[PDB]
Amino acid sequence: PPPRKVVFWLPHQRKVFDFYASQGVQYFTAFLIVSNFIFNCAEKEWDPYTDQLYQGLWRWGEFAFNTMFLIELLINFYGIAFCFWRYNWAWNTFDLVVVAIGTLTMAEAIGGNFMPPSMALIRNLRAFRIFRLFKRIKSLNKIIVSLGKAIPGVANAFVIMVIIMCIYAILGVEFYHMTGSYTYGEEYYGTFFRALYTLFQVLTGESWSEAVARPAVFESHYDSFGPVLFYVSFIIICQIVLINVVVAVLLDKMVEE
Amino acid sequence: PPPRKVVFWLPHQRKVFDFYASQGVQYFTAFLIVSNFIFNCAEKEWDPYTDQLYQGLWRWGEFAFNTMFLIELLINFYGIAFCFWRYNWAWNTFDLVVVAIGTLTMAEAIGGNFMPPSMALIRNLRAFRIFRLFKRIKSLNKIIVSLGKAIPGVANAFVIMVIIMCIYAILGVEFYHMTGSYTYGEEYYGTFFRALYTLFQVLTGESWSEAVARPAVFESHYDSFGPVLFYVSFIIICQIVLINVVVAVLLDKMVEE
Amino acid sequence: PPPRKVVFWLPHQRKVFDFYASQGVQYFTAFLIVSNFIFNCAEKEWDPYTDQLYQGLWRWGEFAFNTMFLIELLINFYGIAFCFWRYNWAWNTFDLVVVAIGTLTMAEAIGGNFMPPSMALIRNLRAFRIFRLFKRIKSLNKIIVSLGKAIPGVANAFVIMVIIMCIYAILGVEFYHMTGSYTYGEEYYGTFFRALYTLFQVLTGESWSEAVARPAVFESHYDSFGPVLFYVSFIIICQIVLINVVVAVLLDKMVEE
């Protein structure tokens, strides 16, 4: 990409900019990204406890990785005049977000917890720094741009599927919310979200064979195969036709681009 | 679409017509459709019981939504001279159907149940008003027209698959209807529909491995691997080949259109 | 198709031939095929027992259907001079086969069982007469010719998959034939065919998670994750990559033709 809107106020901008954007620095920063991800994985495997053994190790290790990423972000923003809205606005925004969260956790971990502790969920976004790798390795950036363009179509397919699942959830609560009168009804179709969750399980292959009772469906008279029809129609329509519609969207975009 | 057959008998027809067909009214009615669907879902989640708590709420809420949809249908039909066979015959037919069922339930819910109670299944078609949304949101109407054109070929594939499943059901009933002599035979292959249902379960991943007994298949002599051949051939031919034939039809149409 | 090799020896051949090949007779024979298939299904559902109730009904019903199909085959072969190798050789061969088996069972059922009883497996080919329907209904014949051309390429994929599955069965018998020292080893990997069958189950989604024991894989030292690698590699390669290779072949042919 050509830098056209980022005019040069800074003394050495054109030099530092094309220094950072060089493929050597890109692959060195990809090295740092992958090593920091492997450091997170190593913390979670060799020391997952709440009362960590090598606690310092992980504290100072992510301290060092985060200050290196802060230095890299400063190099970048010096490169394009700290604007980051003109050139590479999306990736610069993601970089700024992750480095801000990291430096916030750093400042609080060394100099006292200023933020509430239930904010601690954000102390789990370190793992997402790895997504920046999908910008350097172009074999990965290829798949990611194909995915990012297949996303609107896929999302539309998902919304249609969600609406159909909701209709089944609405019906399931109407019909089967009293079977077993926790019964099977009261628990798997008790309310709209228990039913929506039951149908999502069934959608991904969770054996809706306990819902249908063969003695009642077959041994009884010809009026009680309603649940058979319910689950057969759901399976066919949602799982076969609509998941393959999502597939079709995915493949059409993946082979068009 | 151009209105060509709907000649103007009514005083203000050309004005009210293009008023209703304007994108603003389309998105307002999409708002009403989605809010009424969410009202159905809210009734089924926050009050699913047979002796409803906030009954009055759901009764008057669907009263109001249905009278608004009746007003909208009257606006539309005034727009095209109450014909609804010339312009947009399919969607106007669906609108008329759902609004008729709704107003029937309204009249009976406020002024006494004129219809039989076992007719009550139709009091569950409210949930399908949401399908009218697939006419306004064109990202959804796109997927729906692609599906509606892929449905002929897909239906043919399903019929071939059904015929193969029926052949297996006949064979299964003929052979394995006496295993365990409810046994496994009597119940999973007892009659043609128990066998057809067993094979539909197996088709969607329900662990046929209880049908095949390893001691009998392997420990016994080399004559008893019939059920292994049965289930392996069924799995291969129906599951792999024919469900991927359904997929192939789906993708061919989804990428052609 | 044009009849070019079937020269006319018979007195009224050109008339009877294009009488049989007319679309009216084709759809009447499709009616007879579907009704006879539904008669087989009705026998298996409403009377599956070995000591049939309405025996006489099924006996004389398939008697009548088989004599009608014998009359139809005679009409056809009179149509093309009893050659059936020149015109429509494949479908005429299938018709001759099924009608021969049917008339054999007829002659033995009315006039004594001339053949051995363990030949009785062929008395189950009635169900396959339905395949002749795939010649009349052209929406089905379309899917069937696309399948029949995708078969030589799907078969090769299946052979590659089988070869890969035979390698994993050899390795499974080599390694895991002694676990649990019926144990899990001696039963699921005991010999080459128990292992091949275990891997076919696992291939179609049968929960390999009982093979891998988490205490042994994780609690023990770093040398015992061999079965994890075995099943992860099998799943990836065979299930994902090779079943989607079969899919790819299927879709390429289904959209090319």
Next chain:
Amino acid sequence: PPPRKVVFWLPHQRKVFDFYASQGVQYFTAFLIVSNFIFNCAEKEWDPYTDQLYQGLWRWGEFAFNTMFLIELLINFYGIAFCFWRYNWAWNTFDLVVVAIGTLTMAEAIGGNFMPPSMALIRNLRAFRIFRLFKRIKSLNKIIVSLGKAIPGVANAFVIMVIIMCIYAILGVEFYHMTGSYTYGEEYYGTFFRALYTLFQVLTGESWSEAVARPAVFESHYDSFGPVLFYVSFIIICQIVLINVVVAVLLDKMVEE
């Protein structure tokens, strides 16, 4: 392929070379490859024990097959001047590897075990000689070259999927490593590799529904559906979008080539 770099030092090279490369010798060696694979399978089925019955049989049988393959490799290398780097370098390299391992096992099995016994894993590469068949049967070599070119893109898709799985593995150990306080936490999310393995099981259809406890998710207040969101998002994004991305890559290459 034309031999252009393999100049002729040997007396009869041009004759023996095009003798070996003739289709007759290729199909005879395909016969030997398939028969030796079936000999391995027969050893594993009819004699899988550690104290083999017909031990000699298998010993001398693989002796004979390996000396025949050694003779064939010598014929080949005499054909192209023992270079095997100029002509058909990949397949000649694979042939040399497998024949070297075989002759090593032969020499040690007849004249004493020179190598360590824990090297014995290589005594299981006989099964992979069958891959050489994928060079002779061109219907198989076709599928294999299409696969070999789809492997770069597929590998990239797998790496993206692995990174997402790792991210879920890092969040799972963070959150659910204390549920049940072996518990469910301490076993299915205990460390990073238990969590990565749990998510790989779930990815291939292993019933996450035991992780999510419906009483806690629904009966409790509206704060505890975190695991529902975890597993629903994992299923959607990895199981539905990313495995179909792998499919899409596979199909694009399989239909392009």
